[PDB]
Structure formats: structure tokens, C-alpha cells
Design a protein around this ligand. Structure first.
Ligand SMILES: Nc1ncnc2c1ncn2[C@@H]1O[C@H](COP(=O)(O)OP(=O)(O)OP(=O)(O)O)[C@@H](O)[C@H]1O
Ligand SMILES: [Mg+2]
Lengths: 52, 284, 342, 117, 52, 117, 86
């Protein structure tokens, strides 16, 4: 019971690490998309104003 | 760098060729001197393997751990290995065969144990991260029959108390002056796979009084002889494997010297022609 | 293709807020390469602080040759009014090739390697213009308009070697003149050590007098230790037993070698560099596994920027170092290494 | 163009990995020439065993070269190259012989060649 | 020995659950830091490109 | 000036000794780099050790170089210099590490850096 | 090269020898006199052939000096003689 309790705690920490990394990477995924939206909006706006 | 440096590089390769040639002869002296020790140890060990060729036969056997079999859960290996490098692919071609067998037992969950003789065995199996129950190193040119026994003091006590259910010896073997074979074989339980002495079955044996002591002490000399002869025949294999490998280096060094000299003779001729053009074209 | 230009335009980019004006002189480059570097200067904030002086590969051999001097004349205007300028002469070697063309077409006698003999006088008079002038010289030049200010011009010339061969005539001249060199080399660059700075043959002749005290204190240990690590690693290469002093040194040296790698266009402030060196010179790296050392650094910079920014401002503004600074950095490393993850 | 911004990270990391293993193989070749390989460390032997597979997998049949090698040419999509070299450096293929990689268009073709050695 | 083992096992498990819950909330602090920096450089990218 | 008729025999013998040790070590250093130091004679292994110490003991920090080093510069008398090199050539400091010599000053303080090292 | 071609013989003095304490510093086996024993007195001519061959044997054995503990005693004699002549 002492050994399996620490086994449960270590698999919980492994899950917690997994959770930690994924959350960071969805944030990282989000970061890339937003900056691409900003770059796309700026280039469209800029190109039509210079034509104007 | 330039020709001054390249000329200095060639001199270091020429130095290397000599030294790797001297230690080719010195090795070949040791491999003949150690072959005499092997050839003198061989008849005694050959008799011991005939003696157990008897002890495997008969129905007059008493009870005795080393002689009788056992249901197997934990197995031990004695691995002999070098104190010295440069032997080439000797140690690792032995150790992969050991690990293949060790993995084979470890496949079914049978436990395993190692005892090592020699520096390179300790390091490799510590790197793989196996067990090591006992160790000895610094055997040099030739160890004494008493000074290597630490590894067998544990491994014999382990098979006695049922800490072990099999015990093996693991070495290269000197089958030719320029070829040697890695081998693994079992000492305990003294394998009943060996023949019964059926030609002499009519002569079924009578113990002398105190048969426990006479049988135990005799078998201690058997395992002592098998381990020591295996060490000595591995030491003949190392000095032979070194000479073969040192011979190749001397040749490979020779190739490197001719190549480099052809490069230098170009660099020399170019530097003469290049600067002389700068001089003559400077008369303007 | 070892990162010679990358280093020099990152040195320009990082001046965006230091107050130092920049000049980039392009001798003999192709015009689209200039247009690309000017674009990167414009993606960052760096172009507004920079003059770009150009003589492309199409232009006559006299437009080149004369370009470095045209750039220096612009840098001197700031130098003689108590302002700092940083001038990057790119491919001073190509300036020498253009000057050899002119000299041979004028039938002047060739010297070694077919360059004219005065080619040392060409570069030495160019490079001795970069100088720090005392306040009196500024006051005299400005006729009392500016008083009490010392002006400076800093030069970063670039030379290309053909095969690491430093013995060529143009490299030997320019190595003679300058206050140091940074050697970048192909073996390190292919191994992934980028920037590929060889610690052994690189040297600064000004040294610690140029640093802030915090960097001065930490970095003095780094460079000579790292050079001896490379000697020790060779002598080690077939030694199996490694004594603990040696084992520690080879370990520390691999971890410092890994720590000094850095991505392009990603410059680090003083406080960031100081904190990361403090991690190495106080052994907080020592237990950390080597590929994680890269992630360790990124996580440490992130952690300190959210939690401990008042100290970063203190260090960046002052450059100061004291027992409370060592204590606060010790506390930050102890706290990070317990609480966070790499 | 070998820059993370234009190529993106997977391509850039794969190219720098290949460059790092092949550089380290050049550093070992002077040891190997005098000593032979048996003296190397068991990780150095793995670097060599991968680098040699990498050198072979950079080979390719060309449609204009068919007149020389007879063998039919190959066109390889960029995705197959990155996936292929990334697998070799990760050791996904450490069980195949070197000959399996020589002059095969894609990594699928290496494993089919390996079945017949 | 069985009673004492239970108490520590619980104490160990409660510790492990506490650190795992801290790591997920610390991951959300990293996420929200990364997202606010992404937002901060997206506005800053737009404003510089239109100013340009 | 390095001959016994000026320097005296005490100094001359000490300088010739140091040169001979460093020359020998430069040959041994070539063997080591490929065959490894285990392959040497135990006499040659001791010469390699004591040479590699003498090489570091010739280093000395200058109090015109504190700006580079960050450390206090040292001055040595000729008398103390001779005594120090004799001491490495004989056994007195066989037990100190190599790094205990580097940029030290007198031999009388190389023991102190060893205690610090 | 010109003066090597013009002269009757060569005394090569070497720095490796000079730094290692062999002070006269003459490198045998590359040094030569094309006049040889005609130049030389009867006693010196008689005795010097021993030196010439001893140093030749010493040079090849010098490579074994690193591990000359395990050698034929005849070789060990030649090596210890080569050193004492040197
Ligand atoms: N710190 C770095 N990290 C990763 N890659 C880099 C780094 N610095 C430069 N590079 C890359 O190295 C390559 C060459 O850089 P750069 O153009 O500065 O070299 P160079 O020596 O100027 O080349 P040239 O000799 O053609 O002028 C470029 O692809 C660049 O992206
Ligand atoms: Mg460039």
C-alpha cells in the first residue's frame, strides 16, 4: 500500500507534466495564429491604402 | 596550415608507425610466452573434465549441491575481460554474446548476475547497468591461482546457499594464432548433459570414508581449474588480438604517410612557382 | 557563410535604444543582398538609427575603395560632437581588391600576392580614425557649443579568409592594426555552435575596462576556462579513468559551450546575460542535463521577467554588483530551480 | 533560404541535425583511419552507423541519368525527405543495412529494398 | 504498521495532488502570460506597419 | 648569459633540467594522443605529470594585467624562482594537481591554491 | 642545396638533440663524411667503428625504450649500451 500510493502520486505528476506542456503549446499554437492574423490584416490594409 | 606544419604532421605519423610496430612485436612475444602457460594448464584441466565425465555417471551418487541439478530462477556469469585497450574487437564481441544470452534468460524473467575479471568488463556492464556481485582487476601478465578467487568465493557460496541455480564461465578461446572465438559455458550444476561412463559401467564406484569432504574438495579443484584455465586462454587471446590489430595500424599508418607526402610535394612546388611569378612580374 | 554579417547587423539592431548611431558600409555586395539586410533592419526598429552607404558590385572600382572613407566621414560628424557612432565596414577585403584593380591599371609595381605595397597604409589610416576623443578636443571643434562631452567612433571591420588561412597579405595587415579579433569558423558552425566564436584565437585588447562591473566580475572566469576545457578534452579523449577535478572541468565546459549558443535576431539585455552567467559560475547548471540547458535558460529568463523585473531594471540601468546583488541573484536561482520547470 | 521563418522549424531542425551528425563523422574519420572503429565509444559507433545511412539516403536515381544506371528515376516530395531523414536520425531504421538506403527514392523504398537486401 | 502506512500514504497523496494542482494553475499563468504578450505584439505589429 | 660562468652552476643546472623535461614531454604528448597514457612506462608517466606541472608553474600574473585577469599581480626573486623549479623536478610537489600551479606566483603559495582547488 | 652539393660532408646539428641535453648535438646517420677513415688516425680508425654500429643499433631500439622491460636480454644489452655511448 505504501509503494502503490507513491506509484499513484508519480503517475499523477506525469499527467500533471503532460498537462503543463500541452497548455503551453495550445498557447503557442494560439500565438502563431493571432500574429498571422495581425500580419494578414496589416498587409491587406497597407496595400489598398498605397493604391489609393 | 602550411608546408612547415604539414611537414610536422608527417613526422608525428612516422613516429606513430614505429611505436605501433614495436608494440606489435612485443605483443607477439607475450602471446607465445602465454601460450606456454596455456599449454601447461591444458593437461591438468583436460583431466578435470575427464574426472567429471566419470562423476556424471553411476547410480552411487550421494547428495551434493554442485553435482545435482536445480530448478532455475537466478543464473550467474563469470566474465573475463582485459586490463588493457587496443586489443580491437575482442571484448565487445564477447559482451554482445553474453548480453544476448543474458537477455534470453531475462526474457522469461529468470534473474541474472555478473562477476567480472578485468577493467573493461567492469566499465561496460556498469554502463549497460547490470548487476555486479564481485570484481577483480590488475591481473597483468599472469595472475596467481590464488589471487583471482574473490569472484568464485562469492559465486560458489551463491550456488551453495541456493542464491544461484546456474553458474557460467565466459571467455574468448584461442583456436588459432590469428583467430579466436567468444564462448559461454556452464560449470554448475555440473552438467549431466555430459556422458555417463557406460564403457566403465561394470566398475561402479566405491567411496573412500568421508565421501562428503573428498567429493567437495575435489569439485572445488574442478571449478578452480576450469576458471583459471579459461582466464589463461583468454590472456593468450588478448595478446594475439593485439598483435593482429597493431599490425593493421602499422600498414594503415604507412598508407597515410604516402598520401600526405604527395600532398606536400604539390604544396612545395606551387609555393616556388607562385612566388617566382610575383618576383619576375615585379621587374616592371 | 560563417555568420560574419549576421553578427554585425545584430550589433546594429541592438543599438536601437542605446543612443549610439549606426553606419553600415556595403563594399562590393550584390544589391539584392543589401535590400534584404535593409529590410531586416526595417522589420526591427533599427533603420531609423542607421545610415546605409552602398557601393555595389556593379559600380566602378573607384566608387568602392572610396566607400569606407565616405562612411568614416559621416561617422566622424557624430564623433566630433560628443555622440557615439558604430560603423560596420563590410568586406574590407573587397576594398583591397578594388584598390589592387586601380593600382595595376595605373601600372604601379605589384608587391606580395600582387597587391600594392601601400595597402597597409590604405587600411591603417582608415581604421585609426575610429577613436574616442577627450572633452577638450570636442570643445575646441564645437567652439564651446558642446562642453564636457567625450565623443567616440567604434569600428567593426569584416575580413573573409579563404580557408582559415590568416597568413594572406590582407588578413595579416588588418590583424596587425585592430584592437582585437573575433574568429568565426566553419567546424564550429557545422557542429551547431552558432555564433561560431572560437574562444582561443579570439581576443579583445581592451578587455574588462569595456564591461559593466557585473559582466566584468562573472565573464573573466569564462573565457580562459573554456579554452582550457578544449585542451583537456583532447588529452582526455582515450583516458577512461577521469579524476574528479578533470571530470568536473570537462562537464562544466560542455555545459558552458552549450549555454553560449544563441539564435539570430534575438539579442539579450545585460540583466539577461548576467543572470545566465550567474547560473553557470555559481553551478546551478551543474546537475542539469545538457539538452535541457537550452530550455533551462529560456524558462529562467521567462520566470525572472514576470516575477523579478525590478532587479532586471536595476541591473540594466546600473550594471552594478554587490553582496545584495549576489544575494538577490542567489535567491532567484534558488527559487527558480526549486519552484519552476525547464 | 535555410531559415526557420521561411522553411519552418521541422525542416530547419532536420537540416541542422543532418549537418551535425555528418560533421561529427568527419571528426571521427581520422581516429578510424589509424585505429579502426573498434576503439570508438558505443555512442560514437552509433553516430557512424547513422551518418553512413544518411550519406547513402542522400543518393537518388535521376530520370536523365537512366541511360547510365538503367534503374528508373524518382521524384521525391519535400515531405518525404523530412520524414525520411528525421526517422534515420531518431533511429527508427537502425535495424536496416546501409545498402538498403543507396539509390532509393523514398524511405518506403528503403524498407522494400531491405527485405531483399 | 498497516495503520501508520495509511496515514503517510494519504499525506503523500495529498502533497502530490497539491503540487499537481499548483502546476496546472502555474501552466494557466504561463498561458495567460504568453497570450497577453501575443496580444501586445499584435497591436504593436499593426501600429508599426500602419505607421510605416 | 645562460652559461655557468655567469649564471653559476646552480642556475645553469636548473634551466637545463627544465628544458630537458619539457622536450621529453613534447614527444610523450604525441604517444598519449592516440595510444593513451596507460600505454606508457611508469617512468614516462611520472615525467609527463611533472612536466605538465612545470608548464603551469612558469605562469605568473602581472600587475599590469589585473584589468584582464581581475587578480593581484606577483613579483618573484631569482632566488625563489630557482628553488621552486628544483622542487617540481624532484618529489616535493608530485602530489599537487596541475591547476594548483596555474597563474599562482611562488611555489610557496601553489600549495595554498591546491588547498583551495 | 647548393652547398650540400658542393661540399665533401655534412655535420647536421639539431635542436631536438640540443634541447634534450645532447650538447655537441650532432645527429648521426644523417651526418656523413665522404672522406671517412682516410682522414683518421690508426687508433681512432680502429676504435670508432664500434661507436658507429652501436648508435645504429640504438636508434631502432630507442622506439622500444618505452616498454623495454619485456625484451630479449641481448636487445636489452644493445639498448643499454646505445644509451651509455650516447
Ligand atoms: N546565430 C545564428 N544562428 C543560426 N544561424 C545563423 C546565425 N548567424 C547566422 N546564421 C545563418 O548563417 C548564414 C550565413 O550568415 P551570414 O550571411 O551572416 O554569413 P556571412 O559570413 O556573412 O556570409 P558571406 O560570406 O556570404 O557574407 C545565414 O543563413 C544565417 O541565417
Ligand atoms: Mg556577409
Amino acid at each position: 500500500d505504501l509503494d502503490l500510493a507513491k506509484a499513484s502520486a508519480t503517475d499523477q505528476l506525469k499527467k500533471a507534466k503532460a498537462e503543463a506542456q500541452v497548455i503551453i503549446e495550445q498557447a503557442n499554437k494560439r500565438r502563431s495564429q493571432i500574429l498571422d492574423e495581425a500580419k494578414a490584416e496589416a498587409e491587406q490594409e497597407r496595400t489598398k491604402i498605397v493604391a489609393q | 596550415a602550411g608546408a612547415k606544419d604539414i611537414r610536422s604532421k608527417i613526422a608525428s605519423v612516422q613516429n606513430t608507425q614505429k611505436i605501433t610496430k614495436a608494440m606489435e612485436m612485443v605483443a607477439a612475444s607475450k602471446m607465445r610466452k602465454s601460450q606456454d602457460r596455456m599449454a601447461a594448464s591444458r593437461p591438468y584441466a583436460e583431466t578435470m573434465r575427464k574426472v567429471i565425465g566419470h562423476l556424471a555417471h553411476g547410480n552411487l551418487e550421494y547428495k551434493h549441491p554442485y553435482l545435482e541439478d536445480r530448478d532455475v530462477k537466478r543464473v550467474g556469469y563469470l566474465v573475463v575481460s582485459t586490463d588493457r585497450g587496443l586489443a580491437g574487437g575482442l571484448n565487445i564481441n564477447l559482451f554482445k554474446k553474453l548480453l544476448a544470452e543474458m537477455k534470453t534468460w531475462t526474457d522469461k524473467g529468470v534473474q541474472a548476475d555478473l562477476a567480472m575479471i578485468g577493467s573493461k568488463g567492469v566499465s561496460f556492464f556498469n554502463s549497460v547497468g547490470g548487476n555486479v556481485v564481485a570484481q577483480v582487476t590488475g591481473m597483468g601478465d599472469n595472475p596467481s591461482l590464488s589471487e583471482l578467487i574473490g569472484p568464485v568465493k562469492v559465486m560458489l557460496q551463491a550456488y551453495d546457499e541456493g542464491r544461484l541455480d546456474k553458474l557460467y564461465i565466459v571467455s574468448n578461446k584461442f583456436i588459432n594464432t590469428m583467430s579466436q572465438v567468444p564462448t559461454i559455458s556452464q560449470l554448475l550444476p555440473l552438467p549431466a548433459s555430459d556422458d555417463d561412463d557406460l564403457k566403465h559401467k561394470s566398475w561402479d564406484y566405491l567411496y573412500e570414508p568421508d565421501p562428503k569432504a573428498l567429493l567437495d574438495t575435489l569439485l572445488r579443484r574442478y571449478v578452480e581449474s576450469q576458471v583459471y584455465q579459461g582466464v589463461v586462454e583468454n590472456l593468450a587471446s588478448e595478446q594475439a588480438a593485439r598483435m593482429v590489430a597493431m599490425k593493421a595500424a602499422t600498414d594503415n599508418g604507412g598508407s597515410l604517410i604516402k598520401e600526405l607526402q604527395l600532398v606536400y610535394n604539390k604544396a612545395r612546388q606551387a609555393s616556388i612557382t607562385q612566388e617566382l611569378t610575383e618576383i619576375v612580374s615585379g621587374a616592371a | 557563410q560563417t555568420g560574419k554579417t549576421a553578427l554585425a547587423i545584430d550589433a546594429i539592431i541592438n543599438q536601437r535604444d542605446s543612443g549610439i548611431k549606426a553606419i553600415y558600409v556595403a563594399i562590393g555586395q550584390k544589391a539584392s543582398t543589401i535590400s534584404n539586410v535593409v529590410r531586416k533592419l526595417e522589420e526591427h526598429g533599427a533603420l531609423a538609427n542607421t545610415i546605409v552607404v552602398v557601393a555595389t558590385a556593379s559600380e566602378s572600382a573607384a566608387l568602392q575603395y572610396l566607400a569606407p572613407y565616405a562612411g568614416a566621414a559621416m561617422g566622424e560628424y557624430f564623433r566630433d560632437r560628443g555622440e557615439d557612432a558604430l560603423i560596420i565596414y563590410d568586406d574590407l577585403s573587397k576594398q583591397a581588391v578594388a584598390y589592387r584593380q586601380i593600382s595595376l591599371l595605373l601600372r604601379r609595381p605589384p608587391g606580395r600576392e600582387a597587391f600594392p605595397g601601400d595597402v597597409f597604409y590604405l587600411h591603417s589610416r582608415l581604421l585609426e580614425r575610429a577613436a574616442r576623443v577627450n572633452a577638450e578636443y570636442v570643445e575646441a571643434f564645437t567652439k564651446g557649443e558642446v562642453k564636457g562631452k567625450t565623443g567616440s567612433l567604434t569600428a567593426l571591420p569584416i575580413i573573409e579568409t579563404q580557408a582559415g588561412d590568416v597568413s594572406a597579405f590582407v588578413p595579416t595587415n588588418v590583424i596587425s592594426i585592430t584592437d582585437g579579433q573575433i574568429f568565426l569558423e566553419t567546424n564550429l558552425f557545422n557542429a551547431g555552435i552558432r555564433p561560431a566564436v572560437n574562444p582561443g584565437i579570439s581576443v579583445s585588447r581592451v578587455g574588462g575596462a569595456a564591461q559593466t562591473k557585473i559582466m566584468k566580475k562573472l565573464s573573466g572566469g569564462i573565457r580562459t576556462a573554456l579554452a582550457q576545457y578544449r585542451e583537456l578534452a583532447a588529452f582526455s579523449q582515450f583516458a577512461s579513468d577521469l579524476d574528479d577535478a578533470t571530470r568536473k572541468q570537462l562537464d562544466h565546459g560542455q555545459k558552458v559551450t552549450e549555454l553560449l549558443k544563441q539564435k539570430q535576431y534575438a539579442p539579450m539585455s545585460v540583466a539577461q546575460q548576467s543572470l545566465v552567467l550567474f547560473a553557470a559560475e555559481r553551478g546551478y547548471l551543474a546537475d542539469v542535463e545538457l539538452s535541457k540547458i537550452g530550455s533551462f535558460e529560456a524558462a529562467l529568463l521567462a520566470y525572472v521577467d514576470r516575477d523579478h523585473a525590478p532587479l532586471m531594471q536595476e541591473i540594466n540601468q546600473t550594471g552594478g554588483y554587490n553582496d545584495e546583488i549576489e544575494g538577490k541573484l542567489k535567491g532567484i536561482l534558488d527559487s527558480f530551480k526549486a519552484t519552476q520547470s525547464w | 533560404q535555410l531559415d526557420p521563418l521561411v522553411v519552418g522549424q521541422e525542416h530547419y531542425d532536420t537540416a541542422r541535425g543532418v549537418q551535425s551528425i555528418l560533421q561529427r563523422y568527419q571528426e571521427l574519420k581520422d581516429i578510424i583511419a589509424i585505429l579502426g572503429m573498434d576503439e570508438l565509444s558505443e555512442e560514437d559507433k552509433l553516430v557512424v552507423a547513422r551518418a553512413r545511412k544518411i550519406q547513402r539516403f542522400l543518393s537518388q536515381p535521376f530520370f536523365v541519368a537512366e541511360v547510365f544506371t538503367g534503374s528508373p528515376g524518382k521524384y521525391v516530395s519535400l515531405k518525404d525527405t523530412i520524414r525520411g531523414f528525421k526517422g534515420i536520425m531518431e533511429g527508427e531504421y537502425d535495424h536496416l543495412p546501409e545498402q538498403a538506403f543507396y539509390m532509393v527514392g523514398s524511405i518506403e523504398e528503403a524498407v522494400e529494398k531491405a527485405k531483399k537486401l
